[PDB]
Design an enzyme around this catalytic site. Structure first.
Site: not given
Ligand SMILES: Cc1cc(-c2ccc(CC(=O)Nc3ccc(-c4cccnc4)cc3)cc2)ccn1
Ligand SMILES: CCCCCCCCCCC(CCCCCCCCCC)(CO[C@@H]1O[C@H](CO)[C@@H](O[C@H]2O[C@H](CO)[C@@H](O)[C@H](O)[C@H]2O)[C@H](O)[C@H]1O)CO[C@@H]1O[C@H](CO)[C@@H](O[C@H]2O[C@H](CO)[C@@H](O)[C@H](O)[C@H]2O)[C@H](O)[C@H]1O
Ligand SMILES: [Zn+2]
Length: 438
Positions: A325
């Protein structure tokens, strides 16, 4: 102005302007996606389809990012060069991930202009995700042969997944290339996605920021938490807008279908707003935020980092997500906190479910699960408490995105008294205590 004047001027003030603006900057991309869909149904050879979507991706990238698009073009050329150099190795994903790391870190090092880089972080992220996924799919054997240059470039420049598009697999792209009969279900999917996108955009720009002063009748702690919540919900609806728009573009180009039991279902889902706005767990929130992105991260970063342990793989996945990002300190801090929040809440809910024999896991239990208490009042109360904790975490993390490095993040999280980090630390302490007591 008061609530009376605000609701007197709402329609002509922020509904129609925001809707018109949002529509007038996507109509050409939607036209190119529809033209690609109509052109791919003509029975052309596959290489002509790949070349046509390469030209469409070039024109869309030029339309949204002007001359600056060269960085995405050089990234695509460099990714193909790396893929061709190691086309016979079993570590194609390793080389592509290393070259993506070098490229992204070079951009973060400010060798390229900050505004230019920040402008097209999304498109570049999608191109990097597609290249790394194709390399790892070639490594694991999911893709049989190394693609020809025109197929790889068409996959990177798929016009339905170029600007805000969800990451799609190479096999999904090739299925889109084959093409499906234009049906009523397809058109309904596109229309629904566009309508939901415009609704989410309107909510993000008008309803979200002005939620509590006007819509809800309801600088003390309460005021700060209300402002934090409305900034979080506005950020969420902006994300939902991008997600639904990406669904619309991808479906309109011919992708995002599932041929299950000889029955075609246009069911590409990028974001699940209901699972975030009304959250069961923070794990569910993270997953539902961007389903293609979450699947890409879990499949292509988490599984490959399992040799470091579960927690270290979670940190590696969240750090890779932070780099994808673009390195901004507030988003990096949010994702670093999210790693701890999701891991602690996941292991604590597993331990609670095991000890209490209850359906209090981070996801819904299947209909055949060994938990004794499935629909009781205590299970519902614990799930509601964890959902309220998830809403609390969402407001805390979303307070950073109001409309900004270390000082801004520290100030905004100190106005909330670092509450979510203390709750995460207390949840981890509770986890350890209950496990120790056994
Ligand atoms: C301020 C805010 C932000 C956000 C927010 C921002 C970006 C994201 C994208 C993201 O990093 N996704 C993600 C997906 C899967 C994994 C993972 C880890 C371990 C094992 N398998 C999968 C880790 C990260 C998500 C939420 C939400 C709520 N408020
Ligand atoms: C800043 C964080 C990111 C850094 C990125 C750059 C660094 C390179 C990372 C590349 C990476 C992806 C994971 C990260 C993805 C990042 C995406 C970025 C996206 C944009 C942000 C590739 O992952 C590897 O891919 C291989 C090829 O797919 C695969 O190999 C197999 O399957 C193939 C069939 O699939 C098959 O054909 C092939 O034959 C197979 O062998 C491996 O199973 C898989 O682990 C991780 O690298 C791996 O990491 C491992 C421990 O982490 C590490 O193991 C170590 O373990 C002990 C140490 O604890 C130590 O005792 C070991 O001695 C040591 O070995 C590996 O050595 C390293 O290779
Ligand atoms: Zn259960």
């Amino acid at each position: 102005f008061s609530r009376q004047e605000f609701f007197q001027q709402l329609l002509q003030g922020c509904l129609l302007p925001t809707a018109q603006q949002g529509l007038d900057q996507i109509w050409l991309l939607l036209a190119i996606c529809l033209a690609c869909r109509l052109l791919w149904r003509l029975g052309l050879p596959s290489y002509l389809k790949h070349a046509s979507t390469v030209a469409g991706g070039f024109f869309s990238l030029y339309h949204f990012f002007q001359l600056h698009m060269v960085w995405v073009v050089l990234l695509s050329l460099l990714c193909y060069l790396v893929l061709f150099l190691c086309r016979h190795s079993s570590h194609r994903g390793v080389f592509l991930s290393v070259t993506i790391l070098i490229y992204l870190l070079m951009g973060e090092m400010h060798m390229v202009d900050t505004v230019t880089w920040h402008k097209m972080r999304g498109a570049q992220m999608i191109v990097a995700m597609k290249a790394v996924s194709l390399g790892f799919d070639l490594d694991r054997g999911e893709v049989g042969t190394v693609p020809s240059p025109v197929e790889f470039m068409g996959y990177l420049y798929f016009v339905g997944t170029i600007v805000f598009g969800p990451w799609i697999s190479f096999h999904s792209y090739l299925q889109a290339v084959q093409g499906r009969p234009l049906s009523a279900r397809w058109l309904q999917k596109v229309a629904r996605s566009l309508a939901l996108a415009l609704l989410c955009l309107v909510l993000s720009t008008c309803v979200g920021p002005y939620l509590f002063p006007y819509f809800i009748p309801l600088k003390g702690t309460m005021v700060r938490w209300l402002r934090a919540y409305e900034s979080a919900v506005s950020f969420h609806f902006s994300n939902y807008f991008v997600g639904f728009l990406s669904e619309a573009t991808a479906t309109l180009a011919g992708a995002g279908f599932t041929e299950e039991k000889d029955h075609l279902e246009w069911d590409l889902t990028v974001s699940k707003p209901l699972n975030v706005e009304l959250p069961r767990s923070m794990v569910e929130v993270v997953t539902s935020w961007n389903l293609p992105m979450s699947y890409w991260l879990n499949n292509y970063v988490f599984k490959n980092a399992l040799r470091l342990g579960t927690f270290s793989a979670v940190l590696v996945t969240y750090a890779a997500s932070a780099l994808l990002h673009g390195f901004s300190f507030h988003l990096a801090a949010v994702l670093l906190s999210l790693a701890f929040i999701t891991y602690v809440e996941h292991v604590l809910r597993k331990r609670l479910a095991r000890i209490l024999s209850a359906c209090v896991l981070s996801k819904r239990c299947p209909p055949d699960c060994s938990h004794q208490h499935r629909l009781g009042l205590g299970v519902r109360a614990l799930n509601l408490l964890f959902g309220a904790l998830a809403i609390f975490h969402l407001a805390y993390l979303g307070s950073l995105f109001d409309v900004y490095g270390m000082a801004y993040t520290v100030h905004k999280w100190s106005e909330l008294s670092w509450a979510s980090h203390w709750v995460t630390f207390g949840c981890w302490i509770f986890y350890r205590l209950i496990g120790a007591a056994a």
